[PDB]
Design a protein around this ligand. Sequence first.
Ligand SMILES: *[C@@H]1O[C@H](CO)[C@@H](O)[C@H](O)[C@H]1NC(C)=O
Lengths: 49, 34
Amino acid sequence: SYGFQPTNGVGYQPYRVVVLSFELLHAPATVCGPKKSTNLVKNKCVNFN
Amino acid sequence: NLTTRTQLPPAYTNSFTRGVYYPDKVFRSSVLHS
Ligand SMILES: *[C@@H]1O[C@H](CO)[C@@H](O)[C@H](O)[C@H]1NC(C)=O
């Protein structure tokens, strides 16, 4: 058990940790960043994302 | 309960060229990949 007391020092205080794990270069992605979506063009040298 | 359905020693079979899966989800055409 953990004795998390308000009088304890920083070393013995509660600390909440969230570890986010994601894998790139994989199957079709589902969770994506908040970016827009420009229309699609063809037969024209263009940058793509 | 349902123990001892029957009594027989297991047999063995040649798997041949079986059990090969796709290593990754990347399309590859007309290539040899190690
Ligand atoms: C045989 O009977 C029960 C019936 O519910 C079964 O689920 C269970 O696997 C067996 N019980 C034993 C082996 O004690």
